[PDB]
């Protein structure tokens, strides 16, 4: 509507973005089917790197993005209805019961009561004791773990799989980068090439539902799969900023009218508006509240 | 005896909030002194969690430029990764 | 168990102890 | 914990630690296969006063 142009849709034949093979040098997808003019515009998201600009013209970045981190919600902890069977092992449990039938029968034939009261306060005060530090060792066993921040997390571990989609920036970013933690990161990928380095996003989404899997994957992509699944988190920042444009041939004339065009649309924020309409749209302790409610509920009965 | 139960439960109820309260506040305060923040210049190239840079371009940055050290020269990496 | 059934075990010989104070 | 190996102080930074200024000291963390003595060459770099 902006540049009167009649334009036709076809789908490459490969379908697959721009790579290129080191056996040869010869480029395949996006870049082979764009040198020899056999399309002209690229609308496709592509990302704006930089041997990919060296050999083929890109436009100007219409959106700004990075790669990040795609993660399993860990809701795996929750106290639900009751359940305090949990903590304090019902063995604990029947062993003071077992101890409240002996004092309740030894209770009938009771100097004798000074030396039982002091046995029942060192015995339960012995048994709280070793309570409050079973329970204080647990929380301070479950605070001191945390999920994965960010990438740094994650490379202090090898448990969690992770990993990208083959090629396309990722770990050819990645042998790209001097980054030590990056070049720990590339050299997993080099090691662990043959289970995770699927091509489809389904599938790297897909790893992330059964398996521990972490994925890395776009930014804009993470409002899409979180307006979508809701089971489904991000986590770490942004690690480098990429962009989406539009790829066109070397010295191509309409360029400098495609840019122009996407600054035109930018200077109105036309962008955001359907970015906006295609991309969006302590009880572990509250249990004994009511064992107390129903003990005081109980004395009510037997009092009347 | 009914009394007696009642001031049982209500003894018993104050003993375990109190010791929800003390497990909390222990843990709280473990996190609290086991949790140690960066000092070193090494505790910045480490991780990726924090970025940094220098002023401008210049004799901070030359430095690093110039870093045969394989530490200074690793965060060096890393902020010239994305200069931008 | 283990330190617990310890203390269970003190808690009886307490309480025979007792019982032969009542005596 | 107290001190047990070169490891435990390679990841320690509390308490300092040094050799010689200039002998065959040097060599094992100018020279090295283990990124724990290049952690040491970082000690002396950083504390090389
Ligand atoms: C998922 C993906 C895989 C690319 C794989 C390689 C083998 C390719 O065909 O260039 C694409 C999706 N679009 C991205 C882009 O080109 O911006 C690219 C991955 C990426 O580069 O982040
Ligand atoms: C035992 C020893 C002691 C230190 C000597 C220094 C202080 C000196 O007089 O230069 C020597 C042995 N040869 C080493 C060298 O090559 O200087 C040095 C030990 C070392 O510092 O590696």
Same mark, same amino acid.
């Given at each position: 509507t902006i540049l009167g142009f009649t334009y036709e849709i076809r789908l490459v034949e490969d379908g697959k973005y721009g790579a290129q093979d080191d056996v040869n040098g010869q480029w395949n997808g996006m870049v082979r089917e764009l040198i020899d003019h056999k399309a002209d515009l690229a609308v496709a998201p592509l990302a704006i790197t930089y041997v990919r600009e060296k050999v083929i013209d890109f436009s100007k970045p219409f959106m700004t993005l990075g790669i990040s981190i795609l993660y399993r919600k860990p809701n795996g902890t929750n106290p639900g209805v009751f359940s305090f069977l949990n903590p304090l092992s019902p063995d604990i449990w029947m062993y003071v019961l077992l101890a409240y039938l002996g004092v309740s029968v030894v209770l009938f034939v009771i100097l004798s009561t000074r030396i039982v009261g002091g046995i029942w306060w060192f015995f339960t005060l012995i048994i709280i004791s070793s309570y409050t530090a079973n329970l204080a060792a647990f929380l301070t066993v479950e605070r001191m773990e945390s999920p994965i921040d960010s990438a740094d997390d994650l490379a202090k571990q090898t448990k969690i799989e992770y990993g990208a989609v083959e090629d396309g920036a990722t770990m050819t970013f990645f042998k790209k980068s001097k980054i030590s933690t990056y070049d720990k990161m590339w050299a997993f990928m080099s090691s662990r090439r043959q289970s995770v380095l699927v091509k489809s996003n389904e599938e790297g989404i897909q790893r992330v539902l059964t398996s521990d899997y972490a994925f890395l994957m776009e930014s804009?992509?993470?409002? &899409?799969?979180? *307006?979508?699944?809701?089971?489904?988190?991000?986590?770490?920042?942004?690690?480098?900023?990429?962009?989406?444009?539009?790829?066109?041939?070397?010295?191509?004339?309409?360029?400098?009218?495609?840019?122009?065009?996407?600054?035109?649309?930018?200077?109105?924020?036309?962008?955001?508006?359907?970015?906006?309409?295609?991309?969006?749209?302590? *009880?572990?302790?509250?249990?004994? &509240?009511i064992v107390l409610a129903a003990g005081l509920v109980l004395s009510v009965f037997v009092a009347v």
């Open positions: 804009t992509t993470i409002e &899409f799969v979180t *307006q979508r699944n809701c089971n489904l988190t991000q986590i770490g920042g942004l690690i480098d900023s990429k962009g989406y444009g539009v790829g066109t041939p070397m010295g191509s004339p309409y360029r400098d009218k495609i840019t122009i065009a996407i600054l035109q649309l930018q200077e109105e924020g036309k962008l955001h508006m359907m970015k906006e309409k295609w991309w969006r749209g302590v *009880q572990n302790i509250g249990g004994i &509240f």
